Homo-oligomer: A and B are copies of this chain.
Amino acid sequence: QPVDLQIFGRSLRVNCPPEQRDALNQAAEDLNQRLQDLKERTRVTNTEQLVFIAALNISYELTQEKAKTRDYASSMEQRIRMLQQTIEQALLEQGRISERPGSKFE
């Protein structure tokens, strides 16, 4: 299903089903913007060099996002365990107090 795209003055063709077309348009728009911003802050105007550097940057950004995902998950596991421990403490306390043996004088 060949889709023709224009990114940073370059003609690309990519096979893409219609269900992914909006995502493809968004990615084309993202990569266009990335290359424009990279060109601005580095003054490089060679396109092939720009796209290599952009691809390395975005690769690193994906690794960084996956770490954020992993870190959020690791933190949530701990929070859940902490919650479960407060339930266990609630039951232990309830037991400790409720089983208190009564006293009498005689």
Footprint of B on A, CB under 8 Å? 5, 7, 10, 12, 14-16, 20, 23-24, 26-28, 30-31, 34, 38, 41-42, 47-49, 51-66, 68-69, 71-73, 75-77, 79-80, 82-87, 89-91, 93-94, 97-98, 100, 102-106
Give A52 Cβ to nearest chain B Cβ, in Å. 5
Residues of chain B contacted by A5 (CB below 8 angstroms): 56
- When C-beta atoms are compared, the residue in chain B nearest to A44 turns out to be B106
Q: Is the CB of A30 within 8 A of B59?
A: yes
Copies in the complex: 4
Q: Is the CB of B72 within 8 A of A62?
A: no
Residues of chain B contacted by A69 (CB below 8 angstroms): 65, 68-69, 72, 98
